[PDB]
Amino acid sequence: MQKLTVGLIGNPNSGKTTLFNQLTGARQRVGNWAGVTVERKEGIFATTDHQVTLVDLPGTYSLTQTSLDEQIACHYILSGDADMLINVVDASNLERNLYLTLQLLELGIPCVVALNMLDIAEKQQVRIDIDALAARLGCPVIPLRGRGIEALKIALDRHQANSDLELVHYPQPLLREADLLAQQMSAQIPPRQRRWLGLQMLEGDIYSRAYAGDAADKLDIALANLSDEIDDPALHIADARYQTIAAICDAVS
Amino acid sequence: MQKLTVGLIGNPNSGKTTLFNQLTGARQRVGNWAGVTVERKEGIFATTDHQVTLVDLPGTYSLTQTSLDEQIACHYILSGDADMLINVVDASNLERNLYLTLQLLELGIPCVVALNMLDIAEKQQVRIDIDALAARLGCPVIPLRGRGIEALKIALDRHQANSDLELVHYPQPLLREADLLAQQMSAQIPPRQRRWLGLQMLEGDIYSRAYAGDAADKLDIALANLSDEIDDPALHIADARYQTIAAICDAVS
Amino acid sequence: MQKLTVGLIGNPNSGKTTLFNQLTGARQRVGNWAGVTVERKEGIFATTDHQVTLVDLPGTYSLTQTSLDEQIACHYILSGDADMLINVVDASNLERNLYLTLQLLELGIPCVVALNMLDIAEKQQVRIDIDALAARLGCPVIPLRGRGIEALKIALDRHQANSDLELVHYPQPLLREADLLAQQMSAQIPPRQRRWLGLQMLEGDIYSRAYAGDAADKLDIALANLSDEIDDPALHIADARYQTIAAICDAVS
Ligand SMILES: [Mg+2]
């Protein structure tokens, strides 16, 4: 059976260790994240086609104060160590969850959404439309009797590449700059990421500057172009992302 | 920012002035429709890409007694003045609303559906499936905290062309004639419209004859062909449109 | 009007004679299935494009003890007598119904699902999402005031070919053998069926061996290959089909 490294990532409190313990059972071990004493849990389970190494990522609300759990998930996410991500998403706080989701999706990392706590969503009287959600995100959405798990495993095997949906609608000025920023960036990172990194820099993401290399000192002269062409830049971006999530939610829940 | 002329159209009582006042705020003015003393409200708002001139069309149940509100919406709709239409649709009377919708869709006018009064639909215990509705119509469907509006604006920018769905299933005889009628028609009107006009003439739409030009006096000899090949013609057509709406509704609500 | 032979097939008790009596009214007659005294009801109704000969198939839970109702539906299904199938499916026992459905879909027979007893599903508090169901199955799904019937008729005309969805996710070893089995099989049966037949043989379907011809005595040496490569074979297959239905249901109901 083929090897596959999957990252497990989600918001804190959103059922991420439950999923990990059910998937790996006993075939798990605990180490520390390199250089720190933060715990790194790792595990293995078998799908029809793969033998999967599942790495439990620290629980987080955003990829971009700073935080160590945060620097860890992000650093790992940008490393390419992972062939694919299982994004555990709490159905009963769907909007706040999709924030992390969209980031993974604009990065372009092959992603399977594991939609949980669907019992609480019923009580609280929320219904998500699974497959409408899958169509807007561009990636399979699996609702979790060990059913969800089997369905989740199969999706890991069958899913290869998220659809390119251009999910956020940005001012054209903004994209022009994120792009001009993105060519000052290391060949070492894929295209979609360099775009995302370009946009993060225009948002005031300080952290991201350290991922940008050659594009640190071009933010000021990029902030040159936009002043003409526009602005409120970090404003337009946060907003665009906020409109994109608010509209999926109103369409699917 | 780019200019874009959008028509606003819907059934009376279906929340069409509310939407118009929210979109344009104060940047509106009132004139009269050319040649009459019927009020024509016009307004402007800004999307990410466009500066939109919104023209409020008289409220109507059908494009095809006669009526002046009716002659006005239709005349404007066939003029091409409008780059795009926002079709305000009352969720709580979805079937009766889609009648106007289908007409716009068989005409081929780039169309964004604004699905409102979703509060009344809840109480009355109706749920519409937004994105299944969007897939059957071939055009974005936006459910309206100023959320819906932002989602509506973004769709105006992103939507270019309705999908060609062949939505109504017609007897082949019927289409043969609507088509033979449609070549007797002015180069000045697009293909989809000339087909629609051909069909309207076979339905007994008297009004449409004045849009047909050269194809007035061919209805009798078109009604020649169908007598052989079929009939009940105005019957088959009204019915086909009625089946098409009834099946979308049963599939999405 | 064009001729079209449709088979009507479903589980017992799932409303299959009601649908048949409504579609054909009085234009029905009763005969016996060739060689037996089992009743074969046949009927005719008119669609917009076709004049349909509807043949009522014995009610059944599976295509693959043995049974005569069972041998009859299957034999007819593999004969190609039918240009298309109307699969009547009880919404209130959706999972148990889809078992028969999947078999038709892996065979590749142009299929229209007629989704009934939607009243009982409401009471029992089940909602099916029609068009999400249609998208996963690869075939139109029509929910049945003579509405459903009209919508059903139109779909018969418009539907030509199920989408190829590879619905069940099989171990690659399994498919390798079902395929090697499938070339030992008569040119007389289409590709998708010979694959299905290959898989049925590896499942312990005894009945299917008589459809396989030249591939009877290769099951033992096919069971050669898999022992190496795997196993639990009939296990993996039944399971794969069970996961596939369980995941559609969790996604659409
Ligand atoms: Mg849906």
Side-chain angles (χ1 to χ4, degrees), chain A residues 1-2 4-50 52-64 67-69 71-121 126 128-144 146-165 167-179 181-216 218 222-225 230-234 236-253, chain B residues 1-2 4-50 52-64 67-69 71-121 126 128-144 146-165 167-179 181-216 218 222-225 230-234 236-253, chain C residues 1-2 4-50 52-64 67-69 71-121 126 128-144 146-165 167-179 181-216 218 222-225 230-234 236-253:
Chain A
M1 257 188 323
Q2 292 311 123
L4 187 70
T5 294
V6 174
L8 174 78
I9 184 172
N11 300 5
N13 303 313
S14 288
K16 176 176 55 73
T17 306
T18 304
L19 180 56
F20 182 88
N21 285 344
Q22 311 180 339
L23 276 168
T24 73
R27 318 172 281 315
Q28 46 182 104
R29 69 194 181 148
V30 184
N32 299 274
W33 288 94
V36 282
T37 77
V38 185
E39 161 194 303
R40 173 195 230 262
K41 297 197 188 181
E42 178 180 285
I44 300 160
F45 53 87
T47 52
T48 291
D49 288 353
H50 294 107
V52 174
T53 308
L54 183 71
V55 187
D56 161 66
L57 303 189
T60 201
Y61 290 110
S62 199
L63 284 188
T64 163
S67 188
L68 208 65
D69 295 342
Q71 300 176 282
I72 285 158
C74 175
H75 192 83
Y76 188 91
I77 296 298
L78 311 176
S79 70
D81 216 287
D83 313 304
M84 291 188 82
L85 298 173
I86 305 165
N87 180 30
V88 180
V89 169
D90 171 65
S92 71
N93 295 101
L94 183 56
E95 181 188 288
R96 161 170 98 213
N97 285 250
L98 284 171
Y99 188 80
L100 174 52
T101 320
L102 193 59
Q103 287 174 350
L104 313 165
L105 294 169
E106 296 190 292
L107 285 152
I109 323 160
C111 172
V112 175
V113 173
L115 188 66
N116 70 352
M117 284 189 231
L118 304 121
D119 57 329
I120 324 303
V126 38
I128 311 72
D129 189 345
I130 305 160
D131 275 6
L133 192 39
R136 293 221 176 195
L137 291 189
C139 73
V141 179
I142 314 295
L144 296 154
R147 281 160 81 97
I149 301 170
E150 278 331 295
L152 167 71
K153 281 151 151 178
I154 281 53
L156 281 176
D157 288 4
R158 317 182 63 156
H159 184 63
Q160 292 319 326
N162 309 332
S163 299
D164 43 81
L165 296 175
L167 292 147
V168 193
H169 178 46
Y170 288 113
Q172 216 55 200
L174 286 186
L175 299 177
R176 205 198 31 234
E177 307 309 317
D179 275 48
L181 287 174
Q183 39 105 8
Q184 291 329 112
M185 273 176 220
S186 181
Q188 220 71 0
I189 29 168
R192 291 183 65 172
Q193 308 196 357
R194 307 196 298 272
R195 182 164 213 162
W196 183 75
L197 295 145
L199 280 162
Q200 286 318 112
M201 277 178 273
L202 310 166
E203 213 208 309
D205 184 342
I206 30 161
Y207 186 17
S208 283
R209 203 48 67 2
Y211 286 108
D214 188 3
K218 313 300 228 66
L223 290 177
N225 277 43
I230 60 180
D231 65 8
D232 266 297
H236 296 64
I237 266 161
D239 191 55
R241 300 158 185 185
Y242 168 83
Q243 287 328 312
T244 306
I245 308 284
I248 291 36
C249 284
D250 286 311
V252 313
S253 70
Chain B
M1 257 188 323
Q2 292 311 123
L4 187 70
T5 294
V6 174
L8 174 78
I9 184 172
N11 300 5
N13 303 313
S14 288
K16 176 176 55 73
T17 306
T18 304
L19 180 56
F20 182 88
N21 285 344
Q22 311 180 339
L23 276 168
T24 73
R27 318 172 281 315
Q28 46 182 104
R29 69 194 181 148
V30 184
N32 299 274
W33 288 94
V36 282
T37 77
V38 185
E39 161 194 303
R40 173 195 230 262
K41 297 197 188 181
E42 178 180 285
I44 300 160
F45 53 87
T47 52
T48 291
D49 288 353
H50 294 107
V52 174
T53 308
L54 183 71
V55 187
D56 161 66
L57 303 189
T60 201
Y61 290 110
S62 199
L63 284 188
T64 163
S67 188
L68 208 65
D69 295 342
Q71 300 176 282
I72 285 158
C74 175
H75 192 83
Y76 188 91
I77 296 298
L78 311 176
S79 70
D81 216 287
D83 313 304
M84 291 188 82
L85 298 173
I86 305 165
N87 180 30
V88 180
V89 169
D90 171 65
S92 71
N93 295 101
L94 183 56
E95 181 188 288
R96 161 170 98 213
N97 285 250
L98 284 171
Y99 188 80
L100 174 52
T101 320
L102 193 59
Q103 287 174 350
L104 313 165
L105 294 169
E106 296 190 292
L107 285 152
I109 323 160
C111 172
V112 175
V113 173
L115 188 66
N116 70 352
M117 284 189 231
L118 304 121
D119 57 329
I120 324 303
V126 38
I128 311 72
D129 189 345
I130 305 160
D131 275 6
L133 192 39
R136 293 221 176 195
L137 291 189
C139 73
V141 179
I142 314 295
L144 296 154
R147 281 160 81 97
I149 301 170
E150 278 331 295
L152 167 71
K153 281 151 151 178
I154 281 53
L156 281 176
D157 288 4
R158 317 182 63 156
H159 184 63
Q160 292 319 326
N162 309 332
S163 299
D164 43 81
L165 296 175
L167 292 147
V168 193
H169 178 46
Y170 288 113
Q172 216 55 200
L174 286 186
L175 299 177
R176 205 198 31 234
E177 307 309 317
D179 275 48
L181 287 174
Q183 39 105 8
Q184 291 329 112
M185 273 176 220
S186 181
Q188 220 71 0
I189 29 168
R192 291 183 65 172
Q193 308 196 357
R194 307 196 298 272
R195 182 164 213 162
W196 183 75
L197 295 145
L199 280 162
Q200 286 318 112
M201 277 178 273
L202 310 166
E203 213 208 309
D205 184 342
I206 30 161
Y207 186 17
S208 283
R209 203 48 67 2
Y211 286 108
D214 188 3
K218 313 300 228 66
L223 290 177
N225 277 43
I230 60 180
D231 65 8
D232 266 297
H236 296 64
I237 266 161
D239 191 55
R241 300 158 185 185
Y242 168 83
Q243 287 328 312
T244 306
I245 308 284
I248 291 36
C249 284
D250 286 311
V252 313
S253 70
Chain C
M1 257 188 323
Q2 292 311 123
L4 187 70
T5 294
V6 174
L8 174 78
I9 184 172
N11 300 5
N13 303 313
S14 288
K16 176 176 55 73
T17 306
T18 304
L19 180 56
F20 182 88
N21 285 344
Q22 311 180 339
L23 276 168
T24 73
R27 318 172 281 315
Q28 46 182 104
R29 69 194 181 148
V30 184
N32 299 274
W33 288 93
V36 282
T37 77
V38 185
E39 161 194 303
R40 173 195 230 262
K41 297 197 188 181
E42 178 180 285
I44 300 160
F45 53 87
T47 52
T48 291
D49 288 353
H50 294 107
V52 174
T53 308
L54 183 71
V55 187
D56 161 66
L57 303 189
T60 201
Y61 290 110
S62 199
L63 284 188
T64 163
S67 188
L68 208 65
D69 295 342
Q71 300 176 282
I72 285 158
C74 175
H75 192 83
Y76 188 91
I77 296 298
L78 311 176
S79 70
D81 216 287
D83 313 304
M84 291 188 82
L85 298 173
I86 305 165
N87 180 30
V88 180
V89 169
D90 171 65
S92 71
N93 295 101
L94 183 56
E95 181 188 288
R96 161 170 98 213
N97 285 250
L98 284 171
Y99 188 80
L100 174 52
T101 320
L102 193 59
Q103 287 174 350
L104 313 165
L105 294 169
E106 296 190 292
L107 285 152
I109 323 160
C111 172
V112 175
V113 173
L115 188 66
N116 70 352
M117 284 189 231
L118 304 121
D119 57 329
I120 324 303
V126 38
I128 311 72
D129 189 345
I130 305 160
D131 275 6
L133 192 39
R136 293 221 176 195
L137 291 189
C139 73
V141 179
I142 314 295
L144 296 154
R147 281 160 81 97
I149 301 170
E150 278 331 295
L152 167 71
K153 281 151 151 178
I154 281 53
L156 281 176
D157 288 4
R158 317 182 63 156
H159 184 63
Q160 292 319 326
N162 309 332
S163 299
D164 43 81
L165 296 175
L167 292 147
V168 193
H169 178 46
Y170 288 113
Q172 216 55 200
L174 286 186
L175 299 177
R176 205 198 31 234
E177 307 309 317
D179 275 48
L181 287 174
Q183 39 105 8
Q184 291 329 112
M185 273 176 220
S186 181
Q188 220 71 0
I189 29 168
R192 291 183 65 172
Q193 308 196 357
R194 307 196 298 272
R195 182 164 213 162
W196 183 75
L197 295 145
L199 280 162
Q200 286 318 112
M201 277 178 273
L202 310 166
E203 213 208 309
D205 184 342
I206 30 161
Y207 186 17
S208 283
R209 203 48 67 2
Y211 286 108
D214 188 3
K218 313 300 228 66
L223 290 177
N225 277 43
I230 60 180
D231 65 8
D232 266 297
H236 296 64
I237 266 161
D239 191 55
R241 300 158 185 185
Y242 168 83
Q243 287 328 312
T244 306
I245 308 284
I248 291 36
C249 284
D250 285 311
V252 313
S253 70

